[PDB]
Design an enzyme around this catalytic site. Structure first.
Site, mmCIF file in Angstrom:
data_model
loop_
_atom_site.group_PDB
_atom_site.id
_atom_site.type_symbol
_atom_site.label_atom_id
_atom_site.label_comp_id
_atom_site.label_asym_id
_atom_site.label_seq_id
_atom_site.Cartn_x
_atom_site.Cartn_y
_atom_site.Cartn_z
ATOM 1 C CG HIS A 89 -6.545 3.627 5.220
ATOM 2 N ND1 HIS A 89 -6.777 2.936 4.049
ATOM 3 C CD2 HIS A 89 -5.856 4.740 4.869
ATOM 4 C CE1 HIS A 89 -6.267 3.612 3.034
ATOM 5 N NE2 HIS A 89 -5.705 4.711 3.504
ATOM 6 C CG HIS A 125 -2.065 1.010 1.062
ATOM 7 N ND1 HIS A 125 -3.228 0.726 0.380
ATOM 8 C CD2 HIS A 125 -2.196 2.281 1.513
ATOM 9 C CE1 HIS A 125 -4.031 1.773 0.426
ATOM 10 N NE2 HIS A 125 -3.428 2.731 1.107
ATOM 11 C CB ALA A 126 1.244 3.811 -2.647
ATOM 12 C CE1 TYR A 183 -7.158 7.864 3.437
ATOM 13 C CE2 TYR A 183 -6.312 8.799 1.390
ATOM 14 C CZ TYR A 183 -6.103 8.104 2.575
ATOM 15 O OH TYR A 183 -4.840 7.651 2.900
ATOM 16 C CG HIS A 197 0.608 12.699 -0.203
ATOM 17 N ND1 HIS A 197 -0.216 13.361 0.679
ATOM 18 C CD2 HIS A 197 -0.016 11.537 -0.501
ATOM 19 C CE1 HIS A 197 -1.303 12.645 0.887
ATOM 20 N NE2 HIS A 197 -1.209 11.533 0.181
ATOM 21 C CG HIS A 241 -3.238 10.408 -3.818
ATOM 22 N ND1 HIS A 241 -4.348 11.123 -3.432
ATOM 23 C CD2 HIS A 241 -2.752 9.833 -2.697
ATOM 24 C CE1 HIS A 241 -4.531 10.986 -2.135
ATOM 25 N NE2 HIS A 241 -3.571 10.213 -1.661
ATOM 26 C CD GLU A 242 1.158 7.804 -2.903
ATOM 27 O OE1 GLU A 242 2.035 7.445 -2.098
ATOM 28 O OE2 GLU A 242 -0.012 8.057 -2.565
ATOM 29 C CD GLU A 263 -4.409 11.774 2.003
ATOM 30 O OE1 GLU A 263 -4.143 11.109 0.971
ATOM 31 O OE2 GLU A 263 -3.735 11.680 3.052
HETATM 32 O O1 RX3 Z 1 1.386 8.653 1.644
HETATM 33 C C1 RX3 Z 1 0.668 8.906 2.594
HETATM 34 N N1 RX3 Z 1 -0.470 8.276 2.889
HETATM 35 C C2 RX3 Z 1 -1.087 7.296 2.221
HETATM 36 C C3 RX3 Z 1 -1.238 5.934 2.889
HETATM 37 C C4 RX3 Z 1 -0.497 5.758 4.211
HETATM 38 C C5 RX3 Z 1 -0.767 6.564 5.327
HETATM 39 C C6 RX3 Z 1 -0.069 6.393 6.528
HETATM 40 C C7 RX3 Z 1 0.902 5.393 6.634
HETATM 41 C C8 RX3 Z 1 1.176 4.577 5.530
HETATM 42 C C9 RX3 Z 1 0.477 4.760 4.329
HETATM 43 P P1 RX3 Z 1 -1.828 7.740 0.715
HETATM 44 O O2 RX3 Z 1 -3.044 8.534 1.157
HETATM 45 O O3 RX3 Z 1 -0.869 8.543 -0.114
HETATM 46 C C10 RX3 Z 1 -2.376 6.516 -0.361
HETATM 47 C C11 RX3 Z 1 -1.527 5.396 -0.889
HETATM 48 C C12 RX3 Z 1 -2.236 5.009 -2.190
HETATM 49 C C13 RX3 Z 1 -3.536 5.807 -2.305
HETATM 50 C C14 RX3 Z 1 -3.738 6.554 -0.990
HETATM 51 C C15 RX3 Z 1 -4.841 5.923 -0.177
HETATM 52 O O4 RX3 Z 1 -4.619 5.318 0.876
HETATM 53 N N2 RX3 Z 1 -6.052 6.086 -0.711
HETATM 54 C C16 RX3 Z 1 -7.278 5.549 -0.133
HETATM 55 C C17 RX3 Z 1 -8.439 6.229 -0.879
HETATM 56 C C18 RX3 Z 1 -8.439 6.054 -2.384
HETATM 57 C C19 RX3 Z 1 -9.099 5.063 -3.100
HETATM 58 N N3 RX3 Z 1 -8.876 5.247 -4.428
HETATM 59 C C20 RX3 Z 1 -8.091 6.342 -4.597
HETATM 60 C C21 RX3 Z 1 -7.557 6.977 -5.735
HETATM 61 C C22 RX3 Z 1 -6.763 8.120 -5.582
HETATM 62 C C23 RX3 Z 1 -6.497 8.628 -4.308
HETATM 63 C C24 RX3 Z 1 -7.019 8.004 -3.171
HETATM 64 C C25 RX3 Z 1 -7.812 6.862 -3.329
HETATM 65 C C26 RX3 Z 1 -7.357 4.037 -0.214
HETATM 66 O O5 RX3 Z 1 -8.253 3.436 0.420
HETATM 67 O O6 RX3 Z 1 -6.524 3.415 -0.906
HETATM 68 O O7 RX3 Z 1 1.090 9.966 3.482
HETATM 69 C C27 RX3 Z 1 1.645 11.182 2.985
HETATM 70 C C28 RX3 Z 1 1.620 12.245 4.067
HETATM 71 C C29 RX3 Z 1 2.716 12.401 4.925
HETATM 72 C C30 RX3 Z 1 2.705 13.381 5.922
HETATM 73 C C31 RX3 Z 1 1.595 14.207 6.068
HETATM 74 C C32 RX3 Z 1 0.498 14.052 5.211
HETATM 75 C C33 RX3 Z 1 0.507 13.073 4.215
HETATM 76 ZN ZN ZN Z 2 -2.693 10.181 0.140
#
Ligand code: RX3
Ligand code: ZN
Ligand code: CL
Ligand code: CL
Length: 583
Positions: free
Chosen positions: A473, A314-315, A483, A348, A344-345, A372
């Site tokens: 999550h 999970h990214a 989100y 961030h 999305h990444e 996000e």
């Molecule tokens: O990368 C993350 N966070 C993510 C996951 C994470 C959080 C904490 C620890 C480890 C990992 P992600 O949201 O990028 C992240 C990674 C891939 C998609 C994103 C997601 O989860 N999306 C949700 C919602 C979603 C579904 N489909 C989509 C399509 C596009 C965006 C989001 C999305 C999901 O359920 O997967 O954190 C960055 C950050 C650092 C410091 C402050 C603020 C932000």
């Molecule tokens: Zn994110």
């Protein structure tokens, strides 16, 4: 009072940079190579960061925030007073740390096998089955299997997690963990705000639900789909039925107008994971926004390791707290879906770089939803037929039929997500506040899955099932309402950035590519980080202070009209009056 507060802020900031930087890499090493050694080193680096947080947090609590003259300084110290997990006694702290680690590892190493000895990981194996299989029984095997292996195995840890995270939250002045989470938004009206925003997008969701239920009726048979009931949760092209774009082929509004296989189009012209981030980089630079450092390309994990390593797939996007080192970690597949994810990444990543010169305590999104939203905004313009055609991934665009098709593709992703992203923390806030117990974890999950999303489990749930545990999550302890906010506000950002770019005509035709007017509003908001209350950043982008679904509704307005006409001519009951139905 005032001079000591300024010195404290400086001391905290420079020391946190070192401590958090050292934590970031230890955490990176666990994530990019789950072993017992990297697990140990991280749990030890948890203890060093806990020591920092305790030292400075104890000292911050002796400052009366009320007497402080400087606004920025007052806002920092107050934040530092929150020890989060570090507020836990040493013995609870290490238990909570091991629990969090054991949930992450359990989720990330989970496989689903057949008796023949072939085992499937979630990415890309179970994920592809969910997206491409059109066999009721195969989808059910992947869906149940994932919940049998990942969901069930998370359950032994969760009640202890809830107890500990709540305790740390009480110790920092909160009533519970969900209370601590909601306070990130600094909005007393938050729950009402989100509820109103959810109800705004009901008509558009119920009509999408009804349209898709009919299409599944066509495909999967009248015996397995109830036209007045909930949709079985395994039939929407995604493991959690959170996005529905992978079953687009089952629901195409106008099949007489075929659109290119964007995925095979990416494979045909030899697109790589690297290419996808290179294109996201380009969209960010075209807006007059910061490119990723050269270091980014050397250090990031842009594809799933093949050297036999176990990873968190999970990214995520990484800030290493020096203002130079930012990385992405993604198990990237070459499709339109992960191209949107790559953006999305990179949003961030852009956010880290924009506010990199703020105190670390303020190095955050305006609210978690702002963070996000940024990459999703660009990705909305990327996904347009016009821009996709410019990437040579399409051939055209034009007719009202291609329009409805594109809008449907977008709604299956964006609209379908609204009830789901609303749901997760509705469940979790009630777990945290104690109204949902380990006795009701799962039953209450599906109660809300029905209520909000109109979905039923394809197989009845038994004792020991913990379906929330099958979703990242939850064992990973990442808040989810971020989100829901993001999907609403990204269309507001898009609408306002399109206006700055001088886009006339329909919002869904907007492509902000190369707009320095659009770039300027994002950069100005992003540079604030967490320095000011979020309605300011919201005002800076959109000329107003509030969250609204109107920009999202405007974007899909031509689809809402088409859905209403189409459903009315099929005589669809909107919703699931027969809610109790199970397949
Ligand atoms: O990368 C993350 N966070 C993510 C996951 C994470 C959080 C904490 C620890 C480890 C990992 P992600 O949201 O990028 C992240 C990674 C891939 C998609 C994103 C997601 O989860 N999306 C949700 C919602 C979603 C579904 N489909 C989509 C399509 C596009 C965006 C989001 C999305 C999901 O359920 O997967 O954190 C960055 C950050 C650092 C410091 C402050 C603020 C932000
Ligand atoms: Zn994110
Ligand atoms: Cl589920
Ligand atoms: Cl959040």
């Amino acid at each position: 009072d005032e001079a000591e507060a300024s010195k404290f802020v400086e001391e905290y900031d420079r020391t946190s940079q070192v401590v958090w930087n050292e934590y970031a890499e230890a955490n990176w090493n666990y994530n990019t190579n789950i072993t017992t050694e990297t697990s140990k080193i991280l749990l030890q680096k948890n203890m060093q960061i806990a020591n920092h947080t305790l030292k400075y947090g104890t000292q911050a609590r002796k400052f009366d925030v009320n007497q402080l003259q400087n606004t920025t300084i007052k806002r920092i110290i107050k934040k530092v007073q929150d020890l989060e997990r570090a507020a836990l006694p040493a013995q609870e702290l290490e238990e909570y740390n091991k629990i969090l680690l054991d949930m992450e590892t359990t989720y990330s190493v989970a496989t689903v096998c057949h008796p023949n000895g072939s085992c499937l990981q979630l990415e890309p194996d179970l994920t592809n089955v969910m997206a491409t299989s059109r066999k009721y029984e195969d989808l059910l095997w992947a869906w149940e299997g994932w919940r049998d292996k990942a969901g069930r195995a998370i359950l032994q840890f969760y009640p202890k997690y809830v107890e500990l995270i709540n305790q740390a939250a009480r110790l920092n002045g909160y009533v519970d963990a969900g209370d601590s989470w909601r306070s990130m938004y600094e909005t007393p009206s938050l729950e009402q705000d989100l509820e109103r925003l959810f109800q705004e997008l009901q008509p558009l969701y119920l009509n999408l639900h009804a349209y898709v239920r009919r299409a599944l009726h066509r495909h999967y048979g009248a015996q397995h789909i109830n036209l007045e009931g909930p949709i079985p949760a395994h039939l929407l092209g995604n493991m959690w039925a959170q996005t529905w774009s992978n079953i687009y082929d089952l629901v195409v509004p106008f099949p007489s107008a075929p659109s290119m296989d964007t995925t095979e189009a990416m494979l045909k012209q030899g697109w790589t994971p690297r290419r996808m981030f290179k294109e996201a980089d380009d969209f960010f630079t075209s807006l007059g926004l910061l490119p990723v450092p050269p270091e980014f390309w050397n250090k990031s994990m842009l594809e799933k390791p093949t050297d036999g390593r176990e990873v968190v797939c999970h990214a995520s996007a990484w800030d290493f707290y020096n203002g130079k080192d930012f990385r992405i970690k993604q198990c990237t597949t070459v499709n339109l879906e992960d191209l949107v994810v790559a953006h999305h990444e990179m949003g961030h990543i852009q956010y880290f770089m924009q506010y990199k010169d703020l105190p670390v305590a303020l190095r955050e999104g305006a609210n978690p939803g702002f963070h996000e939203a940024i990459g999703d905004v660009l990705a909305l313009s990327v996904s347009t037929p016009k821009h996709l055609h410019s990437l040579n991934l399409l051939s055209s665009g034009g007719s009202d039929e291609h329009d409805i098709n594109f809008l449907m593709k977008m709604a299956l992703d964006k609209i379908a997500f609204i009830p789901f992203s609303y749901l997760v923390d509705q469940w979790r806030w009630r777990v945290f506040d104690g109204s949902i117990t380990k006795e009701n974890y799962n039953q209450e999950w599906w109660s809300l899955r029905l209520k909000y999303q109109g979905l039923c489990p394809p197989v009845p749930r038994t004792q020991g099932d913990f379906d929330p545990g099958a979703k990242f999550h939850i064992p990973s302890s990442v808040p989810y309402i971020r989100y829901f906010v993001s999907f609403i506000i990204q269309f507001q950002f898009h609408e306002a950035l399109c206006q700055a770019a001088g886009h006339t005509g329909p919002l869904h035709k907007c492509d902000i590519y190369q707009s320095k007017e659009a770039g300027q509003r994002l950069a100005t908001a992003m540079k604030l980080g967490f320095s000011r209350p979020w309605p300011e950043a919201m005002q800076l982008i959109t000329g107003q202070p509030n969250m609204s679904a109107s920009a999202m509704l405007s974007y899909f307005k031509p689809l809402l009209d088409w859905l209403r006409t189409e459903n009315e001519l099929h005589g669809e009951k909107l919703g699931w009056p027969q809610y109790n139905w199970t397949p």
